[PDB]
Amino acid sequence: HHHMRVSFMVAMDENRVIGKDNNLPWRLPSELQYVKKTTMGHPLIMGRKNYEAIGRPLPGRRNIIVTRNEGYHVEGCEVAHSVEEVFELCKNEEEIFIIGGAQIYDLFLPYVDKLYITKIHHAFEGDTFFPEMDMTNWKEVFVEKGLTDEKNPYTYYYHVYEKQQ
Ligand SMILES: NC(=O)C1=CN([C@@H]2O[C@H](COP(=O)(O)OP(=O)(O)OC[C@H]3O[C@@H](n4cnc5c(N)ncnc54)[C@H](OP(=O)(O)O)[C@@H]3O)[C@@H](O)[C@H]2O)C=CC1
Ligand SMILES: COc1cc(Cc2cnc(N)nc2N)cc(OC)c1OC
């Protein structure tokens, strides 16, 4: 029904870990820069827990926080309380990025068209995971080696998938 492209933006390890104790288990500033470059201009949709672990809105974008809390407000961020209310807020957007966490990924899982998954070649201790997906009708269209250096001490790859339907 909706008219915007729904895209997932995720970074996960070898066992699909995405978080430990409300934190990225890894420090990869270059990966975060890729996320900034890829999502520039477009709304960011994130769960309340994902937002609070991030701490502040991030400029040049509509930041949309998903919560059941009817009285939740954050300076310079928009609040939505359901998938449909996000779809409302984003009705004239060309593309929106679902940036986590796990519960918010589950929430939009039936709607995802495009998949930006950074795969990190390491097995981290973690408590939150990227959900399993039926990859039937999905095609990998892009893969590139991420920057490994002193500041970014792991091997990782940018993968993109498009749903064929
Ligand atoms: N590497 C990666 O790709 C990323 C990692 N992460 C990590 O994952 C963790 C966050 O994921 P997780 O803990 O699952 O939390 P979420 O980010 O999914 O936030 C959960 C919150 O979303 C709100 N919510 C959930 N379902 C609904 C619903 N159906 N309707 C309305 N609101 C809803 C609730 O907010 P409320 O309680 O206020 O009502 C809930 O507490 C963090 O540790 C973070 O570091 C997150 C994103 C990306
Ligand atoms: C917008 O940048 C951030 C993004 C994330 C989550 C995240 C990080 N990387 C990828 N590829 N996808 C995601 N959903 C987490 C962050 O910190 C906890 C960020 O800022 C510091």
Determine if residue 63 is labeled as part of a ligand binding site: no
* 160-165: Cβ within 8 A, 24+ apart: 160/114, 160/115, 160/116, 160/117, 161/114, 161/115, 161/117, 161/135, 162/113, 162/114, 162/115, 162/138, 163/112, 163/113, 163/114, 163/115, 163/137, 163/138, 164/137, 164/138, 164/139, 165/137
Q: Which two tokens stand for residue 45?
A: 């949709």
50 CA distance to ligand 2 centroid (A)? 9
Q: Which two tokens stand for residue 58?
A: 């991030």
75 CA distance to ligand 1 centroid (A)? 19
Domain count, the chain: 1
Cβ atoms of 48 and 66 within 8 Å: the answer is yes
Tell me the C-alpha distance between 164 and 71, whole Å. 39
**Domain CATH for 28:** 3.40.430.10
3-state SS, residue 101: coil
Tell me the C-alpha distance between 67 and 77, whole Å. 13
Tell me the C-alpha distance between 66 and 90, whole Å. 13
**Which of 97, 65, 105 shows the shortest CA–CA distance to 81?**
65
119 CA distance to ligand 2 centroid (A)? 13
Spatial neighbors of 110 by CB under 8 A, at least 6 apart, are none
Q: Ligand 1: residues whose CB is within 6 Å?
A: 10-12, 18-19, 22-24, 47-50, 53, 66-69, 81-82, 99-104, 107, 128
Determine if residue 123 is labeled as part of a ligand binding site: no
The torsion angle over the Cα atoms of residues 131, 106, 11 and 87, rounded to 10 degrees, is: 160
Determine if residue 27 is labeled as part of a ligand binding site: no
- The residue whose CA is least distant from atom 18 of ligand 2 is 54
79 CA distance to ligand 1 centroid (A)? 14
- What is the sign of the dihedral through the CA atoms of 60, 61, 67 and 72? positive
Cβ atoms of 58 and 38 within 8 Å: the answer is no
Q: Ligand 2: residues whose CB is within 6 Å?
A: 9-11, 24, 31-32, 35, 53-54, 58, 99-100, 118
**Domain housing 160:** 1-165
Resolution (A): 2.6
Tell me the C-alpha distance between 70 and 67, whole Å. 8
**Which of 81, 3, 7, 82 shows the shortest CA–CA distance to 42?**
7
